[PDB]
Amino acid sequence: KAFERCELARTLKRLGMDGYRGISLANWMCLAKWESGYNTRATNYNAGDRSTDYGIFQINSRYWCNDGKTPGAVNACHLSCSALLQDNIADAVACAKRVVRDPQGIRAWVAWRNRCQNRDVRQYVQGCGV
């Protein structure tokens, strides 16, 4: 599913992401925008280390979800990576909450540091009613 900007903003708000572990909704929006363009079926295989990024938040198979073909993988979210490809993002959000509970927080995604950190991220939620 390809989410519309404001549709996603309201959905994440309802799922309790606004201010989760100190992370504002606009930051989560900036993350999803740059990671997948708000698309839930987005996947990216990393030939270099044999892992794959799944879904709207592009969660990696080495630490977070199990896809069976990633060497030395752990499944911290206790989810099949398949779960991160659903139209309903409830599982993806539960796993993203798990990711940020680690010391790095939102910094775990390098794309966040490149395109969101120290930037005006208000634009991602403007006019959405959140």
Q: Which long-range contacts (CB under 8 A, 24 or more apart) does 24-27 make?
A: 24/121, 25/125, 25/130, 26/121, 26/122, 26/123, 26/124, 26/125, 27/106, 27/112, 27/116, 27/121
Mark whether 35 is an active-site residue. yes
Active site residue: 53, 67, 91, 120, which one?
53
91 is catalytic: no
Structure resolution in Å? Answer: 1.8
**What count of Cα atoms within 13 Å lies in the side-chain half-sphere of residue 8?**
28
**Out of 4, 7, 18, 35, which one is annotated catalytic?**
35
State the Cα–Cα distance between residues 85 and 80, nearest whole angstrom. Answer: 10
**Which tokens belong to 43?**
């996947």
Method: X-ray
Burial class (CB in 10 A: 0-12, 13-18, 19+), 53: buried
* Domains of the chain, earliest start first: 1-130 (1.10.530.10)
Give the integer Cα–Cα distance in Å for 28 and 9. Answer: 9
What is Dmax (Cα atoms) for the chain?
44
Please measure the distance between the N-terminal and C-terminal CA atoms of the chain and give it in whole angstroms.
Answer: 21
| Dist CA 63 CA 50 (whole Å) | 13
